[PDB]
Amino acid sequence: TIKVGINGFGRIGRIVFRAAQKRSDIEIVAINDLLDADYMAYMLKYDSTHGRFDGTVEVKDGHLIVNGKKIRVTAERDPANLKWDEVGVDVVAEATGLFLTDETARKHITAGAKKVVMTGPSKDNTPMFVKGANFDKYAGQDIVSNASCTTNCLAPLAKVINDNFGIIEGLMTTVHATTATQKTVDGPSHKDWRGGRGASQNIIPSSTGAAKAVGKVLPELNGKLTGMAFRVPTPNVSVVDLTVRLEKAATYEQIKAAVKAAAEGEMKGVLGYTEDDVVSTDFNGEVCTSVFDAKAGIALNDNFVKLVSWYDNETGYSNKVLDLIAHISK
Amino acid sequence: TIKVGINGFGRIGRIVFRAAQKRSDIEIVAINDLLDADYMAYMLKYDSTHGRFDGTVEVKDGHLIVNGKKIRVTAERDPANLKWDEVGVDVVAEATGLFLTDETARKHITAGAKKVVMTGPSKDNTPMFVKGANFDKYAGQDIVSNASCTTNCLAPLAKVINDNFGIIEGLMTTVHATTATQKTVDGPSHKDWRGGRGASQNIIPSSTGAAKAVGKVLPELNGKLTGMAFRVPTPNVSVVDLTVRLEKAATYEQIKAAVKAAAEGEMKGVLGYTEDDVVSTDFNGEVCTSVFDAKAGIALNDNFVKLVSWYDNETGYSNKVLDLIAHISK
Amino acid sequence: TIKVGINGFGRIGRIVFRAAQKRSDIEIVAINDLLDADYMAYMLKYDSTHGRFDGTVEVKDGHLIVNGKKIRVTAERDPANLKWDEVGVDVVAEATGLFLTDETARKHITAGAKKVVMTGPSKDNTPMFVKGANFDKYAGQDIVSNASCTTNCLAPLAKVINDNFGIIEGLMTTVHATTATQKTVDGPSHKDWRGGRGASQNIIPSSTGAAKAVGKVLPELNGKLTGMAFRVPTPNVSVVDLTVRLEKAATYEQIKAAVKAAAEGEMKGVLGYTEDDVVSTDFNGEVCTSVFDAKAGIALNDNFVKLVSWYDNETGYSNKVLDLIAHISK
Amino acid sequence: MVKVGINGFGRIGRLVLRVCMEKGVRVVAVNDPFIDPEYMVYMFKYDSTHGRYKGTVEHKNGRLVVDNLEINVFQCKEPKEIPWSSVGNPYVVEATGVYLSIEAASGHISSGARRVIVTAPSPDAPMLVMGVNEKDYNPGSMTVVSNASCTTNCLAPLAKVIHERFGIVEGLMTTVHAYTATQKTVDGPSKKDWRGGRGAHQNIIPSSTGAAKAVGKVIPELNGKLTGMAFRVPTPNVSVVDLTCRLAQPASYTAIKEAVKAAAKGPMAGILAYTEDQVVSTDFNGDSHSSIFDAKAGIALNDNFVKLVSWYDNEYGYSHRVVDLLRYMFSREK
């Protein structure tokens, strides 16, 4: 059993925690945030997006008891103080959004942890891994990134399309749910001015490196994709809209067949396939990081096509964070 | 003209700034926040709730130029360092939410300003004034509070109902728009757990001091009213739902006539009256701090009635901050 | 087993259907609406509010196969044409909103059903029944109403409060989720002008007969309660805000204890009790028709108090429709 | 001296009246059998999206009175039964979404309409997009025209500029679109568009458009070279097109920006606008332009493969264009 500590009990930290309860290979033994245990318990117990926690949570002696399992609670701002080895933590899920370089993430190892999974794209050259794309490329590195939710949606789809038909070039839009970085009303975001505008009132353009990052986890695609985002007033679930030019001519039906074969084969559990008349809420709780929407896509011609793929940005990504933890521990 | 400085260019800061341009008695000469001039220009020009700024805004060199007028922009975290006198500020609109005691707010006076209006209820013994309730009780104090948006709605109504029929006791609910203190998705709010929950997903119960604070501005009502709030997924405009026991028997027609008379009379511009089939967006931009909704209210009998009054928590309050600025410097 | 036909496969129809799958005393044998079987399958399978259907749904020969069992699908606009006898229907859940008098609902008996439960307040003298209030007053009548969702929340609470302390008088507000009767953008609603305004943009005052109706299921409360509603931009879950004057002095701790005792006692499964920091999404899927929110309520004194109780207007009500179906079939 | 009649007092009909009031275009009558004069007063006076009508609205003797101007109110189901003759035979703005074909819309002509503008795509009526092909209007042969869709009015002016300067080889469009009156507050029945029945405020909803293909009708060189789709999202107004296109001539993003600016400042003024600000959707609520190019939201992969972004107020921007078109058509009377 791999012992894990979560740093940052936010959306990802809490959905990772819930995804881990269902696994036999992983145990959450410690959580760090900036909160009291009782508050931590409340945040686990109740979720606006994913419903109430399925099981028992209690607080005793300043720590959590989840389904009879004791969990260490700490409130250290500085990862260096976390004393991970005092709870026997093998891997830390780094989910604060603050520590996305080797120098910052490494503090966890300093604090006694063996390895670190960043729950976001690395801001330096920390290697990124996306299940279905390049888990097999992992080389025992002690600090890794699971990339972004969007790359996790795009990469597995882009690979299938590339392997079968060859992507000449592609432009991506993700229509993306509201997240924690955003604001309830027009407020300060000097980093990202559009991002400060009231989340529930607006369609909000956003820049993203997710399409570019696909070139990192699939180097055959380096320089061939880029894109952007629109943030919209939904609480969860997002969608990739991929416009690609193909080397080999392919009917939309042949594309569907290729994606389906991969969903049932090599990409199973990663890439999903549907032909139903689905909308975003139909993927709330979805574990697959990319679900191809066959009816939504459109071809201009045999070589120019718009492809649509859904992802629960919280649940899919959180599950693959756990997959990455398992994989680097093998 | 009264020279005004704004501390905190947030929702209230900015909406005060807009309402000031319409006034001949008041001129905003300086603003303080943690923002660059260009960003401040951006935040002023574009507003999700209230639309584009009616006027010109430029950053020249320089240098915030609004409607041909130079505005000093500073970025001092600490109010003591403001140097208000250097631009000749009489009154400071203190709109950060951080400096709501005499101790803190007095830093503006030591920074060269004559007086301070806090744009929220004071956390100490700082006197509160609500237009239509107790402006005339102002006695030359150098630091005052304009109370809360909800108090500004309830107080004028309460006064009219109390003056005419005698309020034995009342219980209030405000169904209230989401604000800057809330979160886009389930996030940390350690002092208010419920208020951390996804704003756009939820009806969120909330404590309020607005009904008790009525007893402060109208001492005759001390200990006679309390209440609470439900925060709902609207960006602006809130409504007061006041359940009152009356001493003197009154038909609903006599209640209406009394409110209408005050609205056309001594409380003109403060208290409003409508019989239209209104909804919240109909008061987006409303200057009156309390608009009585005749059709919405209901009486069980001549002594027990539910009264409904609207307020633009942003605009109404902001206009009354300026009315208080004007009053205290008469 | 009790054989049920559902007329109107809408929010209530479909949620009644789901709730029936988890009961052994009740099976749905037929569904009527104005829709093809394949569309009915889709509407059942996917739900924006309650997620994917737990189980199997397929269309076979123009009928539904749900968890292995064949459900007849018809599309008759006139209930008299329904041939309920052909599928041996015992009770019809009348959930279209269109047939809420004896005369209209009786078309189902003409069509071969034995009894009818209207999933809304009757517009005539058709008796209403609310679990925890007056189910035991059912007297073999062939057509009944399950009242409204709000009465189902209010009545149980009101009975507990009245039985213990004596409600002298009460005024109620329900802050209520958006429903199917509302409009996405300002549109025509000639019977209810406010109800036509963009549901997601507005707090919308609305009329309710729910507080009066409490008087019909609990005759001792006749003429003692009235109220109204605000419709707000949430898709499901509503809350009762009850302001009561009490005959017998009761501390808030005593009110809490009385509600908790009824919840664990004679009203188990109807009335629930919480002291947690809950918001509306925490009751999405709630089966209890009235969940008392201990920390949200507020007393002015021992005789004047504001009580709060949550309800899933879809799920709670749908479970109780089935409860009423089972009760009248005893 | 144009006189206008409005059929259907909905989002488009009411805001078409608003724009008419703003421009001094005389509206002589409104027909809507589902909204009586008093109810019309209410719907026009209060607007959740565009605010209270800035002026006066009253009912008097079965008439709608706006800023003291009396408007006849009709209550007729059928176009051919509306007394257009009794109000001086106006141009008719057909804004019900029910009478779309030349044949259906021509019902207004029978009863006295001089011309009809269908405020939507039509299966057969000529599409006219201001700034793009309005000169295609032939008063000698066209009594019924279409002002196309809101999306087409956004995409086409941009497409024209890009195609003329650089050549569009092919393009695929997405529009991220505000919800409308055809959608549902909670999952409900939409027999002909299952996704469109799902709760509008809870969901991103994939949706079909023919706007990108329709651009090939008003710009014939682009016929067969564009298609696309939509996502309906939980906003009440304002949409955005996201156009991914391959260009024939190499074009730096600066060249693209300069071409749009020039068109915006010159021949497409009031139709195509250009911004470099950090805008969001609410920044264009109440904007009169057909298309506001968002320079900073767009992205190029190379000099031949670019994603362009343009905003549009699908309600009020489109209504401005309805009014612009009827005024243009009136200017063409021989």
Ligand SMILES: NC(=O)c1ccc[n+]([C@@H]2O[C@H](COP(=O)([O-])OP(=O)(O)OC[C@H]3O[C@@H](n4cnc5c(N)ncnc54)[C@H](O)[C@@H]3O)[C@@H](O)[C@H]2O)c1
């Ligand atoms: N939400 C998504 O859809 C999503 C998906 C994939 C990846 N991510 C990434 O995961 C990371 C976290 O995202 P999130 O959405 O969970 O954000 P979040 O705001 O919900 O969570 C951040 C949490 O970290 C806590 N925190 C802040 N400072 C801390 C500190 N110094 N030490 C310990 N805890 C601290 C905060 O209290 C909060 O609970 C980011 O890198 C984000 O980009 C988010």
Ligand SMILES: NC(=O)c1ccc[n+]([C@@H]2O[C@H](COP(=O)([O-])OP(=O)(O)OC[C@H]3O[C@@H](n4cnc5c(N)ncnc54)[C@H](O)[C@@H]3O)[C@@H](O)[C@H]2O)c1
């Ligand atoms: N928005 C409303 O409906 C409403 C109504 C009445 C009163 N109020 C009160 O007004 C005050 C502000 O509310 P708001 O809604 O404008 O919040 P806000 O978050 O929109 O504004 C706060 C602003 O203050 C700035 N700020 C933070 N620290 C600062 C510092 N120390 N120095 C200078 N600026 C600083 C922030 O950058 C932000 O721009 C609060 O006291 C609030 O309770 C709000």
Ligand SMILES: NC(=O)c1ccc[n+]([C@@H]2O[C@H](COP(=O)([O-])OP(=O)(O)OC[C@H]3O[C@@H](n4cnc5c(N)ncnc54)[C@H](O)[C@@H]3O)[C@@H](O)[C@H]2O)c1
């Ligand atoms: N939604 C709630 O919170 C709620 C709660 C309690 C009670 N109710 C009541 O239940 C009833 C229906 O409510 P709803 O929210 O499900 O509405 P809904 O609009 O979701 O459902 C109505 C359904 O009936 C169908 N229908 C219309 N005419 C029909 C006909 N002649 N024959 C058969 N089917 C027809 C429609 O296609 C639709 O599917 C109403 O009386 C309502 O007041 C609703």
Ligand SMILES: NC(=O)c1ccc[n+]([C@@H]2O[C@H](COP(=O)([O-])OP(=O)(O)OC[C@H]3O[C@@H](n4cnc5c(N)ncnc54)[C@H](O)[C@@H]3O)[C@@H](O)[C@H]2O)c1
């Ligand atoms: N809303 C938009 O963003 C938008 C933009 C551009 C074009 N359009 C198009 O304009 C048309 C109207 O759209 P809308 O959003 O105003 O819809 P809407 O539902 O708001 O308005 C339609 C109106 O037509 C009325 N009506 C129905 N039948 C009628 C008849 N028999 N005679 C007279 N009136 C009748 C209805 O009462 C309603 O008021 C549609 O074709 C739509 O596709 C809509």
